[PDB]
Amino acid sequence: AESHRLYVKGKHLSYQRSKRVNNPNVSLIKIEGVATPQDAQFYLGKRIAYVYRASKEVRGSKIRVMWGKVTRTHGNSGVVRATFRNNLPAKTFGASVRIFLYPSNI
Amino acid sequence: LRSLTTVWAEHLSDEVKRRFYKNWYKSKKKAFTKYSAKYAQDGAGIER
Amino acid sequence: TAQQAPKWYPSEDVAAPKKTRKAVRPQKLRASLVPGTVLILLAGRFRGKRVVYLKHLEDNTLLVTGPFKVNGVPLRRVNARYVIATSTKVSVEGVNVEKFNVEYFAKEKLTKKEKKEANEIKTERVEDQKVVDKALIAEIKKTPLLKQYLSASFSLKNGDKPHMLKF
Amino acid sequence: VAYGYPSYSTIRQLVYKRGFGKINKQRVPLSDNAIIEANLGKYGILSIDDLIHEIITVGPHFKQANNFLWPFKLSNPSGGWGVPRKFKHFIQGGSFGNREEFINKLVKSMN
Amino acid sequence: VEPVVVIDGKGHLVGRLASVVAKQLLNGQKIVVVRAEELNISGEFFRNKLKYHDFLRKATAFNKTRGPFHFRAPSRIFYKALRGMVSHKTARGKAALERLKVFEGIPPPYDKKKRVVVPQALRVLRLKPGRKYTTLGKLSTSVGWKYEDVVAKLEAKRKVSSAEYYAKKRAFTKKVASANATAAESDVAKQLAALGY
Amino acid sequence: ASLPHPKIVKKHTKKFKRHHSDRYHRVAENWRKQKGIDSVVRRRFRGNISQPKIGYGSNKKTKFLSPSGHKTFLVANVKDLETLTMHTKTYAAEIAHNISAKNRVVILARAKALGIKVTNPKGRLAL
RNA sequence: UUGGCGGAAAGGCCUUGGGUGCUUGCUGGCGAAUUGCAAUGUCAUUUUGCGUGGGGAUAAAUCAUUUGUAUACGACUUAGA
RNA sequence: GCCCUGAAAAUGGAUGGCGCUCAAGCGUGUUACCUAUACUCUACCGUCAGGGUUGAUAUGAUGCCCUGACGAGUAGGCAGGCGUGGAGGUCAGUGACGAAGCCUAGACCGUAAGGUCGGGUCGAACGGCCUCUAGUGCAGAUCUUGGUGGUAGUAGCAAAUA
RNA sequence: AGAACUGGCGAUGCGGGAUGAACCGAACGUAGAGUUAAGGUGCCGGAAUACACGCUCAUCAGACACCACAAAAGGUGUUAG
RNA sequence: GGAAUACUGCCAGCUGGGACUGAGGACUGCGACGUAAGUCAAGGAUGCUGGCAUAAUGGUUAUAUGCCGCCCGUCUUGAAA
RNA sequence: GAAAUUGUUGAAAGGGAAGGGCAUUUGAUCAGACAUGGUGUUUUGUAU
Secondary structure, eight states, rough: OOOOEEEEEEEEEEEEEEEEEEEEEEEEEETTTOHHHHHHHHTOOOEEEEEOSSSSSSOOSSSSEEEEEEEEEOOOOOOTEEESSSSSOOOOTTTEEEEOSSSSOO | OOOOOOOOSSEEEOTTTGGSSSSHHHHHHHSSSHHHHTTTSSSSSSSS | OOOOOSSSSSSOOOOOOOOOOOOOOOOOOTTTTOEEEEEOSSSSSSTTBBBEEEEETTSEEEEEEOOOHHOOSEEEEGGGGGEEEEEEEETTTTTTOTOOOOOTTTTOOTTSSOOOOOOOOOOHHHHHHHHHHHHHHHHHHHTTHHHHHHSSBBOOOOTOOOOTTTO | OEEOOOOOOHHHHHHHHHHHHEHHHHHOOOOOHHHHHHGGGGGOOOOOHHHHHHHTTTTTHHHHHHHHHHOOOOOOOOTTOOSOOSSSSGGSSBBBBBBBTTHHHHHHHOO | OOOOEEEETBBBBBBHHHHHHHHHTTTTTEEEEEOOGGGGEESOOHHHHHHHHHHOOOSSSOOOSOOOOOOOOHHHHHHHHHHHTTTTTSHHHHHHHHTTEEOOOOOOOOOSEEEEEEEETTTHHSOTTOEEEHHHHHHHHHHHHOOOHHHHHHHHHHHHHHHHHHHHHHHHHHHHHHHHHOOOOSSSHHOOOOOOO | OOOOOOOOHHHHHHSSOOOTTOOOOOOSSOOOOOOOOOTTTTTTOTTTTEEEEEOOOOOOOTTTTTSOOOOOEEESSTTTTTTTOOOOTTTEEEEOTTTTTHHHHHHHHHHHTTTOBBOOOOOTTOO
């Protein structure tokens, strides 16, 4: 078909932070279509991939992936907390992530 | 205000086109030579 | 001597581990996974394909077939957490399935010496494919538009919210 | 502080989960009935529920039974304190003082 | 969800629209603002005119060319209210402001694209009836903006050209709205109706 | 070829460089404690360099172990090598820096005979 | 390919004709595996360079010299086949 | 009660800024949410305290092991260690097949003082361990001596007729 | 400038009060997870452009302790007595 | 006159989704299910599987980004001064 | 034959300082582990 997407679009908002200090080990992700903590309960435990591109091909691809998962909700407007194997570079604030539908409880 | 079109005359005198040169003496003088080729036609590019 | 000596060398013999108390109980699958249910594959070659769940194997995997004649998915096993169980239920009563087990899908691990420089199918695997399909294909035709539904591929369009959709 | 009148359920949950004894000036988790009988047995206390009986029904050996229990190390309430500012009297919209029966709702969230 | 969102500035409040747009850019969304000359600010015209003159009095004493610049165009009053809402001195903030374009009137290609509104920044929904307000074009032309007359002429030309487009669109929509009605109440049509569509 | 050990954790890998060792060429990177009265480093202000303290100490079980697993032992000749003839599983030998090129060959051959690992079997090798 | 419209930053919009390809509007036949139970599993656009084979046109500026409507030096303004 | 008059000071300017008008203001009430080195649980380091363990084989009973709590710090006190010159003993230690020294966004160990290794350069002596000894550890003292910069191709090299 | 009691700074980092030795919370070994304090939840900036009842229009509104000022006297401005 | 519901409180009532942790290392103890061998979620993680087996993970180093970070030593109640 | 200070070459960054802490991307560079043994002898130098 015209579309082949099997993930949910998301945006990397920022790290977990107070007013003056931030915590790079935990990031905030905005999932499209979610606007309340009840909706984000479905997405807890799902895997998040950040798919960026480099110029050096490493093992047969110029595309590199950063993996993570959704841990808990955040606030009142459907923002979630995520942790990755390696933290996102903070240059990707406002970049798109990929929230997958696995593992599935359906 | 922003100019959108400039149209020039068929023949430009040898003293007005010295305004467009810094070293006039060493040149082929190469000024409006192709623009004068826009003329010699009835309406090709002048009143368009 | 550059280094004099350590007075007491640690004993180099390994010690036994304690008696672990972790028994293994059979996995309890979620109620949405019933044999004959149509599933959606979320990962693999056939991600986005709709496929028919036949049997639950010993190693927690789900036996599944396309059928092959409909969408090309052969007899495989998949992980229960990597699929979505749809509500479209179809009967598999009368399908010979007990033959397939954990040892049926043997990879026959290759040696490291056989390095792939630049670049086949078992005869018994295709024959078991048509036997399973024949008992299934003639039964898919009963409900209209199921074959066109199975042959098609699933994907997410603009505006679908998986937390509100009913799969 | 914030003190109130505990019920049976909150005493039982405090002793069962956050229950430690003072043995030879050491904080020892109960986890069993033998150690309670080892120290408090001479007052007739044999089980973890016998000790709870001396607490809720103040017995002749309440002082000995209470001193055996190490101070209860509680967490913050799971749902918050329910007030914007703590250090006012509970009557005045704060937290401190005598909250008579509302201590159970507070301690159960901490425990 | 959408690559570039075009926002019609007409009838919006400067501060509430600025806060919404500032959060969109920082989240990676590209925003284009049109018709910035007819935004709205709460408070009567004189009060907001005095506030600009108070702002217009601040300049670096020893050299006026390095002091706070006072931009007079309506799209720059909106941009100032937005740049003060972003960490504009950082690399991330600078990238947020290259996702933003503000125009007086509706220029080319954005004139053939859908314009949206922000209901939480609209004056008719936020302000109480009977409360006074000021329009950005009037305020800007009082403090030195020079291009109100030309943009008004260009906007009037745009609306006339955008008038027969809708007239053609309205007529063609009628043809479709009648054909499918005839094509309705058919064996296929009932099945769609039973399935919500 | 190393005895089973838990995963090695450090809790700190960045070297403790002295304050202002980057600001002046007289101040060496060797760690010194700020004994001054207004030092932001000594007063532990946020955003400043962290000071060594006993909290960073390594786990006693994985302490002194090389990533290969063995504790490292300096040897000067063959006689220092049979000192490890029964502890090959928990000890690895370094040939010292001042051992001559010809004498390194004899040591390496004997370590292979006894199976003792040598962490630097490359010093002074002709090619 | 016919014909228009659009100058605010038009660089886009509409339309005549024929040709070609596809069509899931409907009904059929063949293939799909083995990536082994998942690994973005690679499908987009921005610039540059060398080869291609096919069109098109054959400049100045600076220094040096000179002038003083200019000038601390730069710069400026003149002139020189 | 809120608002307004009363209500005047010097560079341009401060509810932190933008901005906010059924507020993003004021009074009040109910919730949800954000996060400190704090509170709860766990792992690791060290200290303190209470204990177990002479039984053979294998050597630290100053050893090993179990348990509980605790950890801010100037002036200051005490303890355990790192490093340097020289001395007694030991390694029948290293070395012209290359000692020491020096350079090295190369590697390893230690919380740290520091120790080790590889490469380059080099040329004649030096080290580990147990003890002894002190002219024994530098960022400052308008410190001492020596060497070297920015300033900087800069100020300047214009009295006495040529 | 000088006393009394207590708590602090000196000698002390950490979260809040934009900023600050003393204020509020809370005192500190190295980390992980959870919950909070004081303070907040339009954007800067993590978190409700939440909910509910009212009041206020300022041609110098107001916006939160220490704290970074304003009074007596007045107003058919408006509200309630 | 007979009920329900709200509110509050209890259950040694059942159950789904998510995250962090796996310390210890032959046995000993307290228990549960069992007429009994025995089993167990009972004094701290095991089982099955895949890929790679290499700079892929990781270390170092330079840079970029988010947030934070005032110049050391001393006298001083108080020093970035 | 050290340092300060300097030249050439190479790499990198640079919108009114520079340097630093936490975390990660990118480039460059690099150590370790990488075959236990083994059932076994399809074996050669017949015991490898």
